[PDB]
Each structure stands twice: as structure tokens, then as C-alpha cells.
Amino acid sequence: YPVLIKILIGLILGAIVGLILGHYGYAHAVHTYVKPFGDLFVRLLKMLVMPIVFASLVVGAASISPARLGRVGVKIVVYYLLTSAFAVTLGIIMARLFNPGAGIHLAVGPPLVHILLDIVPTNPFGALANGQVLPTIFFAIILGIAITYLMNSENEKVRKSAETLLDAINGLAEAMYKIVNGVMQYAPIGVFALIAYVMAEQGVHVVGELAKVTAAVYVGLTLQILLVYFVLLKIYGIDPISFIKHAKDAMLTAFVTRSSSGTLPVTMRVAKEMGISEGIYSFTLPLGATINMDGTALYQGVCTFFIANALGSHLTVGQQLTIVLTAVLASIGTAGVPGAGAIMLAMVLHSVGLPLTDPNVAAAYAMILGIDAILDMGRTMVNVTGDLTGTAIVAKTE
Amino acid sequence: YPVLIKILIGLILGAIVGLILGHYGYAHAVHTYVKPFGDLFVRLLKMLVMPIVFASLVVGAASISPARLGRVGVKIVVYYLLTSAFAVTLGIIMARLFNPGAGIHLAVGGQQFPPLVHILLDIVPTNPFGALANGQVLPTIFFAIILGIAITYLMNSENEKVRKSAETLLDAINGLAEAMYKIVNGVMQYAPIGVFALIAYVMAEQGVHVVGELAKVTAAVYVGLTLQILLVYFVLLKIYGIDPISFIKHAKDAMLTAFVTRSSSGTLPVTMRVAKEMGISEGIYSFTLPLGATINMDGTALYQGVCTFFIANALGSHLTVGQQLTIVLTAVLASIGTAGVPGAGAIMLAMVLHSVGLPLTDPNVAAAYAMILGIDAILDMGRTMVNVTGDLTGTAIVAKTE
Amino acid sequence: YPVLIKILIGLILGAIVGLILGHYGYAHAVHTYVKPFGDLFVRLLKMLVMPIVFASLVVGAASISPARLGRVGVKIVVYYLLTSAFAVTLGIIMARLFNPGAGIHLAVGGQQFQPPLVHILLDIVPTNPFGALANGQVLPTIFFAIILGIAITYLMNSENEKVRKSAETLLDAINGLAEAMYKIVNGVMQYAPIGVFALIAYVMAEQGVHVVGELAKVTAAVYVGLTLQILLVYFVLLKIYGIDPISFIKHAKDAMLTAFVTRSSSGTLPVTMRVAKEMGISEGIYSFTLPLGATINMDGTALYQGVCTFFIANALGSHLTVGQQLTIVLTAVLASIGTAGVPGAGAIMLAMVLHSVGLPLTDPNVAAAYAMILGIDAILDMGRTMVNVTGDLTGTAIVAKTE
Ligand SMILES: N[C@@H](CC(=O)O)C(=O)O
Ligand SMILES: N[C@@H](CC(=O)O)C(=O)O
Ligand SMILES: N[C@@H](CC(=O)O)C(=O)O
């Protein structure tokens, strides 16, 4: 086989092979035969997430405890908020440029505090065994700091055993990085199969008003990359073209998997092999995979308008900053799983005063939901790109 | 900030600030705003339990396998049974002294609804990873000992490759164990806020209900819990030559945590660090302390003795002029059966009631039992603190014998 | 105490003490008193499975990555398929020799109820290795343990020696745990005599006092087929490969007896792996082939199902197709692979081979005869499981000597 631009060869062919097959009613032919090969690829990547996230972040607390972590924390969080606040606003502009909703809608027919407290796991083993990335992040930092403190103990028996544990954890972290290299050998077949399904199932439904909303989303996602990331990398001195060259693997994976969390092992390997320290990326990237959802903010901003246009609400000629605010909250609230943005979109809809209980909102929401995997691909790719852009920026600041 | 007597400054202030706010109907205000801070403290301690308990016991199986473990096991178990058997008897006396139940258990209508061998067999885990991932302190204890013993045997093998790789594993386990202790030092900095907020809740909620006959039962419990410490612990430590006043000085942190948390199990990280930092060997404390967090419930045994009487007095049963040793026996059984979670003693009280012959099906027993349950957290605090103190006392005594 | 033939002293005594007690209506006396001591034994062995399987296979990827694992894999899989294909055919021959089903399956009324294949192959790759470990799940663990071990070997040859040190550290700790579990199975086998005694004591005093008449005919059919699987297949196949069959039994005694009395192929795994270790097989071979065999290679199940399909077909008077009973041969292989290392699943997986011959559990006379077999299932499971485990060791030994 040639280079690993065979992902592109599988992507273009898979889009064509898919899109054609689904038009001829063979949606279930692709699902029953091609999709399992795409699922295996996701299966392999999900596997690596839990070890790689924990193990790299424990070794991630090699760097200065007060600063770095403290500084990099505030830095990355401030970055994350501002990018998501910009992302929805850009989606609003796209939903005022394109006007997705002339026709009358088809046919008819969490305690917050108890979320913050849930960042602290009550069983680190239980958290590890149950996915649960955010609680793992917390424990891994707390452990990693403790180990560093133990290594400066006057007692050299504690210093030995603390260094021992840290190595064994590092060995495991380093092992998962060697595996993501290997799992990327299957990627072209996995990529091929994954867009093959989405095109041959939801792609043959991107017609009419649904094409208008998808056009509004994707051009907003393109303008997110160019107007925000490409600009923001340029101001920070980091070459935007060398950035995409290095981030190509994680972007394509994020686009195809639609799982920000599932793309994490290949995102962290990209950050490793672009010369960022485990001190920065072991913290920023998993956090970004749960908290920074830029393409979701844009997706929600342009979808709140879709429904409000499809019902004929004026969308408050003034107070659509309620969307902007709430879409940031929804972005953070959104999971790194490959569907949650459409589910979380419900929260920004009740913010604008149109609940899914009114059967005509539900009618238009069900119409958006039919092409969600199409919208998810580009949205997720931007979600991951936002994470890497933020990491690269903050890693240069430090 | 001053010293870590800011726990006391946070305890007194919290009990006052709570007590007042709850009297003025702001029980839900405290619950929505103050309680989460006390919950964070609990979250943080719960976090450390599983790793600290497993890892320290594996390293704790450094001591002599046949003895220590063997000898220490029998010693602590014999100790645990006797303290508990005393604790109930002391609670019976307190319930004959104070007479909690002159009035007829008023309203009626608000009712409530283990195979023993399939309990012993459950000490052996079928999946140690599963055990660790699922709480389950007891099966973990079992496995951690078996592993730690296997490691010691492995290090004395003629094959030095097996010796090197075993010694490696033991260190990494110790590294983790040691790391968790460093963390409990950190999480204790939050303790004052955590304490403040936790009594702020209980006082502002069930405290403003400790009135009348419920005050009489509370008095009887607490004076019993006081008399457990002085008559049993302070005496038993004194006879074993360990200084009782130097004992409390060291146990201050664990005792206060246990009281405020009400989780015997959740207080374990701070109890074990108190055992470490009073110079007991991991060989002893890594075994006796988590075991005592599940098997040794002294303050529960007392609570159950005095509450069996409250109910029997509220219904006017004679509480068998003679055979209330059935309580004494069954309360020990209930104590052992009780969990280190912060409610179970009230739940387990049901077992000693059916022993005396008054089930929760009779809706007048159920009426009295529901009244006790209304001030349970108030009773749970003192009860849990005494629960944990018994663990340390036992460890100190047994450690000194060995 | 004497030697570790105290297992036999406990087995013989337990079979007798049981068989007597269950005849005198004390089935529940044995269950409530003797069975917990047998259960403790099982409990203890189950405990070691997950750590020993994971850790030994990670260290097991010490051997050559492309070959060994690749070669041993194809070899053992090919071995497994051919032994299972022969096993059912042998059971067919036993079910034609003995004729289990002359009387009409009397009593009607005790009915039972009526996996997506691709969504099984994909499940071999775990989405959370910790979850996998914490949930039993031997097969996803096998996949991850290999991938991890191979990654470590690659990491130790890296030009960066910080990555080489930390990787060697991890490998050692894992080996430390692997080795620890082996020392433990040495100990848990001291309890085995009491465990064995109590376990057959139950089965004999409960299902043994029911092995009478037609059910004794079907039991006789099974056990003579299991014996001929040992003598005609294993004893022969070891002899062709040069490995001494009598020295093989001498060493495999501990794993065989355990497997027999436990009926859990998976639960016998620590004692099967320690037998393979102390007969001098490399962890590269046995740490891969034995846990795979305890999930894929069910030879005694294949035989059990072949002879049980015939039992129900004879009981209903179906001619069992004078020609196409290779449908059973094929499907019993698939049912063997499908069968779990749990101590009862072979009777449950027998339902699949019955629908392959066209006689479902919905028909109230099939469900009557199936429930009759089910009543003596543990008697059949003992010999079946022991042969299941024997097949794993035989293959491991043959494939190890090939490599
Ligand atoms: N697929 C997105 C979530 C979403 O669809 O909003 C992600 O994981 O980033
Ligand atoms: N919460 C107490 C048990 C009880 O309430 O009886 C403890 O764990 O010590
Ligand atoms: N108990 C058997 C399975 C079966 O009953 O077929 C085994 O694991 O080997």
C-alpha cells in the first residue's frame, strides 16, 4: 500500500460508493455488510481511550504543579469559552445569510450542582471501568501531583516506589500510543465503510430545505476554521498550514467517527508528534473532548433558527443573545459521543421559548434529526480542531 | 489560616448557624446552598477509600504471614465482639435509666416494607477487578491479603527473575498506597468548610426536631456513647498502657470526620492516616481498620439497644423481665450486619426488633420507628464517631500486644 | 495429610456419601450443609481467573509477534475445529450404538422459551479494557492482553531508553501479578479435597438418584463416547506427535479433576494454566491457547449435543434424516464454539442444534424430553467439561511441540 493518504482514497470512494447505493434503496445493504467494518475501526479506537487518557495525564503531572496546570487551566478554559461564544454567533450570521425555513413544517404526528460534584469520582476504579472521562481527568491529575511530591520525599524508599509506579503508568501510556499507530493502518477501510453508511442513509435525504440548512452549517464550519482558527494561530505565530498538515489524522478521524471522545487517542498522538509536552496536551485535549464543542455551538445556533423560521417566530429582533449564551452552555453540556448535540439542542430551544412538546416544533426537530449524522461529521471535526488549536496556542504561551 | 482546629471553629459555627436557620424554616435553603459544600468533602474522601484500602493492605502483608495476620486476626475479632457486646448492654442500661416512651405512639399510617452462608461466601470475590470497581471493601480485604502474601513468598524464590518482577509490583502498589496518604493530607485542608456545611445541614433539618421524647432518646444515646468512651475505651487503653489522652490527641481528625460524615467507610482514608501517623505498622492497621469499618460497629450496637427500648416503651411491652439478652445478642449481630454507610444502623435496627418480637408490619411499631428515623442523622453522628473510635482503640490495643 | 491424591479420596468418598444421602430424600440436607464447602472452592478459583488470564498473556507476548502468535493461532484454531468436528461424529456413533429413546416422552407441561454473529465478532474488541477486566469477559480481555504485550515488546526496542525503562517496568509488575496468582493456585488446591468432596456430594445426592432407565442409557452413551474421545482422539493424537500420553495424564490430573467437579471450564482456568506451566510449556503458547480453548474449544459439549439431539429425536420417533445428520455435526461445532465456560450452557446451546434438525422447544413434546435431559445435566456436565479442558491441554501440548 501507498502512503496514509489512503484515508482520502477511501473517503472519496466511500462517499461515492455510499451516496450511489443509498439512492437505489440499498440503505440496508450497506448497513448489513459495509458498516461492521466501520464499527470495528471505532471499536479499536474506543478501546485505547480509557488507558491513554488516564495514563498520559498522570505522567502529565510531571510539569510544575502550581503553574502550568493552574495557568494552562485558566488559559485553556478562557480559550474554550471565547471560541464557543464566537462559534454560535457565526452560526447565527449563517442562519441570517441563508434563510433555512420558508415552508410550513412538514406534517404533524440535569441539576448542575449535581454535575460539578460528579467531577470528583467516588471510586477511581469504578470511573475507569465505566468510561467517565471527566472524573478520570480529576483523579489522574490528583494522583500525578501526589507522585511528584512523593518523589521529593527525604525517605528514598518512598521515592523509589513512587518512581516505580510512575514508570509503569508511563509504560502503559506509551504502549497505547504505539497501538494508535497500528489502529491507523486499518483507518482507510474504516473510513471507507463509515461514510459509505452515512451517505447511503442520510445523504440521500439532504434535499430541499435540508440542503439549505446543511449548506448554512458547513459554510459556517468553514468560516470557523478560516476566520477563527487560521486567524488565531497566525496571531500566535504558529504556522496554520503546518498545523493542518500535522492535525490531518485527527481531523479526518473526528469527521468520520463523529466521536470527539473516540478520536482522542489519535488526537493526543498528533499532539505528541507535533512536539507538545504531555504537561499541556494530556490535560487540554481530554477536557476539550468534553467541554469544548465549537462546531456544536454553531450547529445549535443555525438549528435554533431553522425551527424558528419553520414556525415563523421572529426570533426576538434583539434578544437572540439568549441563543448565544445558552448555546455555549449546551456546547459544554454536550457529550463527546456521536449524537449528543442534537439531544442538547433541546436546551437552547426552550431558552428561545419553543419546547419539543408543541408538536410542530417536534415536527421540524424530527426533520433536522434525519440528517444529523451528515451534520455531525463536519461539526465533530471542528470540535476536535478547536481542541488542537487551543492546545497549540496555550502550549506556545507557556 | 490558623491550625487544623479550624475544624472545631467550623463545627461550632456550623451547628449554631444550622440550628438557627432550620428553626426559621430555612431547611431547604441550607440544603440547596450549604449542603453541596459538605458533599464535596464526602466525595473527596470516598474517592480515596478503594485505592488506599487495597494498596495499603497488599503492602500491609509485609508482616509475618502465619502469625501477625493470623494472631492479629483472632485478637481483633475477639476484641470487636466484646466491645460490641458491651456497647449494647451499656445502651440497655441507659434506656432503663432514661425511660424513652411514656406517651402513646400517636398517629398511625406511614409504613415500611440475607441468607448468612451467601454472605460468608461473598467475602471471596469472583473477580477482584470487579470488587475494586464496585466499592465492596470486604472482598477486597480478602484478595489484598492473598495477593500481598503471595508477593512475599515470590520474593524468596530461587528464580531471581520472579523475585525482581514481584518486588517491582509491590513497589508500584506501595507508590499508589503512599500517594493516597499524601492526598488525605490535602483533602483535610477542605475539612473545615466540609465540616461546617455538613452539620449546617443536619442541625438545620433534624436538629430542629430533637424535642420532647425525641430529646430523651437522644440524651440516653449520647450519654451512653460518652460512657462507652470513658468506661470502655479510656479504661481499656489505660490497662493496656497506651496513653488515653495521647490517643485522643492523635484520633482527633478521624473522630471529627466520622462524626460529621457518618460514613465509617468514607472516613477510612483519614482513619488510616491517623493510624499511620501514630506509628502503628501497616501490617496491623491496614487489616484491622477496614475490617472494623464493616464489622465493628460499637455506637450502632448502643444505638440499637436504646432504640429497641424506645419502641417497646412506646407500645408498653415489658421488654421481657429477664430475656433482653436477646437484644444484646442480636444487636451484636445487627452491628456486624450494619454497613459503614451513613444510614444503615436505623435500617438494621429492624432486625433486633423482630428478635424481641415487634415487626415493622404492626403499624404502631412502624409509627414509632418512623419517629426515630426522623432524627436519625442526629443519632448517626455520635454513633459513627464511636464506631470509628472502637476501630482505632482495637488497633492500638492489638498493635501493642503484637 | 498425605499426597494430593486426597482429591481422589474425597471424590470416591463424596460420590458414595452423596449417592446414599440423595436416595434417602436428603437432597436438601446436602445442599444446605455440604454444598457451601464446594462453593467456597469454586469461589476461590474464580477469583484468580481474571488476573491470571490478563497478566499471563501480556507477558505471553514475549515470543515473536508475527510468527508464534500468528502461527500458534492458526494451528490451535485449526486443531480446535477438527477435534470438535470429530467429537460430535463420535457422539452420533454412540447414539446409534446405544438407542436412547424407545418409550414415548410421557408428561406434557413444563415449556421453555423460543445472537447476531457479527455483533459477536465485533465484541472481541473491548471498548473499555478496564470494564472488560472488571466484568469477567475473557475473550475481549484476550484480545487486549495480546495487543498490550506486543506493544510492550516494541517499546523495549525503542531508541529512547526512557520509554524502554518504563515499558520494562510495566512488564515486570504485570509479571509480578501473573506469578503471584500461580503461587495462589498452589494454595487453593490444598482446599481442593474438601471442595471436590462437597461438590460431587451434591450432584450425586440430587441428580444422581435420577440416573435410572432411559436416562441411564443416555448417560452411558455419553460417558463411553467421552472415554473414546480420550483414547481414540487424544491418546492417539499425542502418540503421533511424540508427546507421552501417560505422562500427559500424570501432569494434567489436577486440571482434569477440577474441571470434572467444577463443571466450569473457565473457572478451572487458573489450575489448567498452572498445569501447563509445570509441564514446561512456554507462556507464549499456553497463555493464549488455554483461555481461548476455555471459550472456543468445547469437545465434550460437541459430543454431548450430538448424543442429545438423537435422544430427543428417538423419543419423538423422528428418523433423524437417513443421510443429513451432518447438519448436526456442523451445527454442534457452532454450538460448541457458542457454548460458554460456565457450568451449564451446553444444555442451553443444545437448543440451537435442535432447531437445526427441525425440532423446536415450542413443541410441547420436545420441551418435555429436553426437560428430562436437563434433570440429569450436571451428571453429564462433569464428564463433558473435563473433556472440554482435556482438549485444550492436548492442543496446547501438540501446538507447543510443533513450535
Ligand atoms: N459528535 C460531537 C457531539 C455532537 O454531535 O454535538 C462530538 O463528539 O464532538
Ligand atoms: N453510619 C454508621 C452506621 C450506623 O448508622 O449505624 C457507621 O458507618 O459507622
Ligand atoms: N460446563 C461446560 C460447558 C457445557 O456445559 O457445555 C464447560 O465449560 O466446559
Coordinates of C-alpha atoms in Angstrom, one line a residue, chain B residues 92-371:
Chain B
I92 CA -29.9 -1.1 77.7
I93 CA -28.8 0.4 81.0
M94 CA -29.1 3.9 79.5
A95 CA -32.6 3.0 78.3
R96 CA -33.6 1.8 81.8
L97 CA -32.1 5.0 83.3
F98 CA -33.8 7.4 81.0
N99 CA -37.2 6.0 80.1
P100 CA -37.8 7.0 76.5
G101 CA -41.5 6.2 75.9
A102 CA -44.2 7.3 78.3
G103 CA -46.6 8.7 75.7
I104 CA -48.6 6.5 73.3
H105 CA -47.1 6.5 69.8
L106 CA -49.6 8.8 68.4
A107 CA -50.6 8.7 64.7
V108 CA -50.9 5.5 62.6
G109 CA -50.3 5.3 58.9
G110 CA -46.8 5.6 57.2
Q111 CA -45.5 2.1 56.9
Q112 CA -42.2 0.3 55.9
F113 CA -41.6 -2.9 54.0
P114 CA -29.8 -12.1 54.0
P115 CA -29.0 -15.8 53.8
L116 CA -25.9 -15.8 56.0
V117 CA -24.0 -18.5 54.1
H118 CA -24.5 -16.5 51.0
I119 CA -22.7 -13.7 53.0
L120 CA -19.6 -15.6 54.1
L121 CA -19.1 -16.9 50.6
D122 CA -19.3 -13.3 49.3
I123 CA -16.1 -12.4 51.2
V124 CA -14.3 -14.3 48.4
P125 CA -14.6 -12.2 45.3
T126 CA -15.2 -13.9 41.9
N127 CA -13.5 -11.0 40.2
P128 CA -11.0 -8.8 42.1
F129 CA -11.1 -6.1 39.4
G130 CA -14.9 -6.1 39.7
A131 CA -14.7 -5.9 43.5
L132 CA -12.4 -2.8 43.3
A133 CA -14.5 -1.2 40.7
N134 CA -17.7 -1.8 42.7
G135 CA -16.9 -0.5 46.2
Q136 CA -17.1 -3.8 48.1
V137 CA -14.5 -3.3 50.9
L138 CA -14.7 -6.8 52.4
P139 CA -13.9 -9.0 49.3
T140 CA -11.1 -6.5 48.6
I141 CA -9.7 -7.1 52.1
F142 CA -9.7 -10.8 51.4
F143 CA -8.0 -10.5 48.0
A144 CA -5.5 -7.9 49.1
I145 CA -4.2 -10.2 51.8
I146 CA -4.0 -13.2 49.5
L147 CA -2.1 -11.1 46.9
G148 CA 0.3 -9.5 49.5
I149 CA 1.1 -12.9 51.0
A150 CA 1.8 -14.4 47.5
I151 CA 4.2 -11.5 46.8
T152 CA 6.2 -12.1 50.0
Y153 CA 6.5 -15.8 49.0
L154 CA 7.5 -14.8 45.5
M155 CA 10.4 -12.5 46.7
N156 CA 12.0 -15.5 48.4
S157 CA 12.1 -17.6 45.2
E158 CA 15.4 -19.1 43.9
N159 CA 14.5 -17.6 40.5
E160 CA 15.6 -14.0 40.8
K161 CA 13.6 -13.0 37.7
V162 CA 10.4 -13.9 39.6
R163 CA 11.9 -12.0 42.6
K164 CA 12.7 -8.9 40.6
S165 CA 9.2 -8.7 38.9
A166 CA 7.4 -9.3 42.2
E167 CA 9.4 -6.7 44.1
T168 CA 8.6 -4.3 41.2
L169 CA 4.8 -4.9 41.5
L170 CA 5.0 -4.5 45.3
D171 CA 6.7 -1.1 44.9
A172 CA 4.2 0.3 42.4
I173 CA 1.4 -0.8 44.7
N174 CA 3.2 0.9 47.6
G175 CA 3.7 4.0 45.5
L176 CA -0.1 4.3 44.9
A177 CA -0.7 3.5 48.6
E178 CA 1.7 6.2 49.7
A179 CA 0.2 8.7 47.1
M180 CA -3.3 8.3 48.6
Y181 CA -2.0 9.2 52.0
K182 CA -0.4 12.4 50.6
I183 CA -3.9 13.2 49.2
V184 CA -5.7 12.8 52.5
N185 CA -3.4 15.5 53.9
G186 CA -4.7 17.7 51.1
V187 CA -8.4 16.9 51.3
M188 CA -8.2 17.6 55.1
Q189 CA -7.5 21.3 54.2
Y190 CA -11.0 21.4 52.9
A191 CA -12.3 19.7 56.1
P192 CA -13.3 22.9 57.9
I193 CA -15.6 24.0 55.1
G194 CA -16.8 20.4 54.6
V195 CA -17.5 20.1 58.4
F196 CA -19.2 23.4 58.6
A197 CA -21.6 22.6 55.8
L198 CA -22.3 19.1 57.0
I199 CA -23.6 19.9 60.5
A200 CA -25.1 23.0 59.0
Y201 CA -27.4 20.6 57.2
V202 CA -28.2 18.1 60.0
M203 CA -28.8 20.8 62.6
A204 CA -31.0 22.9 60.3
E205 CA -33.1 19.8 59.4
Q206 CA -33.4 17.1 62.0
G207 CA -31.9 19.2 64.9
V208 CA -34.9 21.4 65.0
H209 CA -36.9 18.2 65.8
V210 CA -34.9 16.9 68.8
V211 CA -37.7 17.9 71.2
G212 CA -39.7 16.1 73.9
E213 CA -39.4 12.3 73.9
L214 CA -37.0 12.5 71.0
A215 CA -34.7 14.6 73.1
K216 CA -35.0 12.0 75.9
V217 CA -33.9 9.2 73.5
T218 CA -31.0 11.4 72.1
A219 CA -29.8 12.2 75.6
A220 CA -29.9 8.5 76.5
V221 CA -27.9 7.6 73.4
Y222 CA -25.2 10.3 73.7
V223 CA -24.6 9.8 77.4
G224 CA -24.2 6.1 76.6
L225 CA -21.8 7.0 73.8
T226 CA -19.9 9.1 76.3
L227 CA -19.9 6.2 78.7
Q228 CA -18.7 3.9 76.0
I229 CA -15.6 6.1 75.5
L230 CA -14.8 6.6 79.2
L231 CA -15.9 3.3 80.7
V232 CA -14.7 1.0 77.8
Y233 CA -12.0 2.7 75.7
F234 CA -10.2 5.1 78.2
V235 CA -10.2 2.2 80.6
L236 CA -9.1 -0.5 78.1
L237 CA -6.4 1.7 76.7
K238 CA -5.2 2.6 80.3
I239 CA -5.0 -1.1 81.2
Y240 CA -3.0 -1.8 78.0
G241 CA -0.6 1.0 78.8
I242 CA -1.3 3.2 75.9
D243 CA -1.9 6.8 77.0
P244 CA -5.7 7.6 76.5
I245 CA -5.1 11.4 76.3
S246 CA -2.3 11.0 73.7
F247 CA -4.7 8.6 71.9
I248 CA -7.5 11.3 71.5
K249 CA -4.9 13.9 70.6
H250 CA -4.0 11.7 67.6
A251 CA -7.5 10.4 66.8
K252 CA -9.0 14.0 66.7
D253 CA -9.0 14.1 62.8
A254 CA -10.6 10.7 62.2
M255 CA -13.1 11.1 65.1
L256 CA -14.3 14.5 63.8
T257 CA -14.5 13.2 60.3
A258 CA -16.5 10.2 61.3
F259 CA -19.0 12.3 63.3
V260 CA -19.6 14.8 60.5
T261 CA -19.5 12.2 57.6
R262 CA -21.4 9.4 59.3
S263 CA -19.7 7.1 56.9
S264 CA -17.4 4.8 58.8
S265 CA -16.2 3.6 55.4
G266 CA -15.8 7.1 54.0
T267 CA -13.7 8.2 57.0
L268 CA -11.3 5.3 56.4
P269 CA -8.6 7.3 54.5
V270 CA -8.4 9.8 57.4
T271 CA -8.6 7.0 60.0
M272 CA -5.7 5.0 58.4
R273 CA -3.6 8.2 58.1
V274 CA -4.2 8.7 61.8
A275 CA -3.1 5.1 62.4
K276 CA 0.0 5.7 60.3
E277 CA 0.8 9.0 61.9
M278 CA 0.5 7.5 65.4
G279 CA 3.2 5.0 64.4
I280 CA 1.4 1.7 64.0
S281 CA 2.6 -0.7 61.4
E282 CA 0.7 -1.2 58.1
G283 CA 0.8 -4.9 59.0
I284 CA -1.7 -4.2 61.7
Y285 CA -3.7 -1.2 60.8
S286 CA -4.2 -1.9 57.0
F287 CA -6.0 -5.1 58.1
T288 CA -7.9 -4.1 61.3
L289 CA -9.2 -0.7 60.2
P290 CA -11.2 -1.6 57.1
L291 CA -12.4 -4.7 58.8
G292 CA -13.5 -2.6 61.7
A293 CA -15.2 -0.2 59.3
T294 CA -17.5 -3.1 58.3
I295 CA -17.6 -5.5 61.3
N296 CA -17.0 -3.3 64.4
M297 CA -20.0 -1.0 65.0
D298 CA -20.0 -0.2 68.7
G299 CA -22.0 3.0 68.5
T300 CA -24.5 1.2 66.4
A301 CA -24.9 -1.6 69.0
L302 CA -25.6 1.1 71.6
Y303 CA -28.0 3.0 69.3
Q304 CA -29.9 -0.2 68.7
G305 CA -30.1 -1.3 72.3
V306 CA -31.6 2.1 73.3
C307 CA -34.0 2.3 70.3
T308 CA -35.4 -1.2 70.9
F309 CA -36.4 0.1 74.3
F310 CA -37.8 3.3 72.9
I311 CA -40.2 1.4 70.7
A312 CA -41.1 -1.2 73.4
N313 CA -41.7 1.7 75.8
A314 CA -43.9 3.5 73.3
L315 CA -46.1 0.4 72.9
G316 CA -45.8 -0.6 76.6
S317 CA -44.2 -4.0 76.1
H318 CA -42.5 -5.3 79.3
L319 CA -39.2 -5.9 77.3
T320 CA -39.1 -9.4 78.9
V321 CA -38.2 -9.1 82.6
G322 CA -35.1 -11.3 82.1
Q323 CA -34.7 -12.1 78.4
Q324 CA -33.4 -8.8 76.9
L325 CA -30.1 -10.5 76.4
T326 CA -31.7 -11.5 73.1
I327 CA -31.4 -7.8 72.2
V328 CA -27.7 -8.0 73.4
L329 CA -27.0 -11.0 71.2
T330 CA -29.0 -9.7 68.2
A331 CA -27.7 -6.2 68.4
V332 CA -24.2 -7.5 68.1
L333 CA -25.5 -9.4 65.0
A334 CA -27.1 -6.2 63.8
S335 CA -23.9 -4.2 64.4
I336 CA -21.8 -6.7 62.4
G337 CA -24.5 -6.7 59.7
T338 CA -24.6 -2.9 59.7
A339 CA -22.8 -1.1 56.9
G340 CA -20.2 1.7 57.1
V341 CA -22.6 3.8 55.0
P342 CA -24.3 6.7 56.8
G343 CA -27.8 5.3 57.4
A344 CA -27.7 1.5 57.9
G345 CA -28.0 1.3 61.7
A346 CA -31.5 2.5 61.6
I347 CA -32.2 0.0 58.8
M348 CA -30.5 -2.8 60.7
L349 CA -32.5 -1.9 63.9
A350 CA -35.4 -3.7 62.2
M351 CA -33.5 -7.0 62.8
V352 CA -33.2 -6.6 66.6
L353 CA -36.9 -5.6 66.8
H354 CA -38.2 -8.8 65.2
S355 CA -35.8 -10.6 67.6
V356 CA -37.7 -9.0 70.5
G357 CA -41.0 -9.7 68.7
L358 CA -42.2 -6.4 67.3
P359 CA -42.1 -6.2 63.5
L360 CA -42.5 -3.1 61.2
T361 CA -45.7 -4.6 59.9
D362 CA -47.6 -3.6 63.1
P363 CA -48.4 0.0 62.1
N364 CA -47.9 1.2 65.7
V365 CA -44.3 -0.2 65.8
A366 CA -43.9 1.3 62.3
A367 CA -45.2 4.6 63.7
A368 CA -42.6 4.8 66.5
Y369 CA -39.8 3.5 64.1
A370 CA -40.7 6.3 61.7
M371 CA -40.4 8.8 64.5

